[PDB]
C-alpha cells in the first residue's frame, strides 16, 4: 500500500535491487557455469513472502 513502514519499504528496496539481469562479463570468467539469473522474480507471477 501507500502507507508502509520503514522496515517494509527497506525490505522492498533490497528485493528490487537484486531483481536484475546478470552482467554480461560474467560469462567470460573462467569456469563460469552461469547462464542467467535463475532468481529473477516478476511482480505478477510470484508474490513476495510478506
Amino acid at each position: 500500500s501507500s502507507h508502509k513502514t520503514f522496515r517494509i519499504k527497506r525490505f522492498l528496496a533490497k528485493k528490487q535491487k537484486q531483481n536484475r539481469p546478470i552482467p554480461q562479463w560474467i560469462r567470460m570468467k573462467t569456469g563460469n557455469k552461469i547462464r542467467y539469473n535463475s532468481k529473477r522474480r516478476h511482480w505478477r507471477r510470484t508474490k513476495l513472502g510478506l
Binding site: F6, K9, R10, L12, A13, K14, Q16, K17
Partner: protein, 60 residues
C-alpha cells in the same frame, strides 16, 4: 540534490553541506528512494547560487 546516508537527518545534512562546501543553505527536504537510498534537496541561501557551487563541486 545529494545522496546521503539513510541515518542522517535534516539537521545533520545541513551541517555537513555547510562545512565541506562553505555554503549557507535555506532548507533541506528529504526523501528515501525506492532503492533504499536517501535523497536530500538542499536549497541554498539566496546570496548563494547553486550553479557555480555545482560547477566547483564538479557535477555540471
Amino acid at each position: 540534490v545529494f545522496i546521503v546516508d539513510v541515518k542522517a537527518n535534516k539537521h545533520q545534512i545541513k551541517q555537513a553541506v555547510k562545512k565541506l562546501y562553505d555554503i549557507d543553505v535555506a532548507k533541506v527536504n528529504t526523501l528515501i528512494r525506492p532503492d533504499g537510498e536517501k535523497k536530500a534537496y538542499v536549497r541554498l541561501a539566496p546570496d548563494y547560487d547553486a550553479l557555480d557551487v555545482a560547477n566547483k563541486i564538479g557535477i555540471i
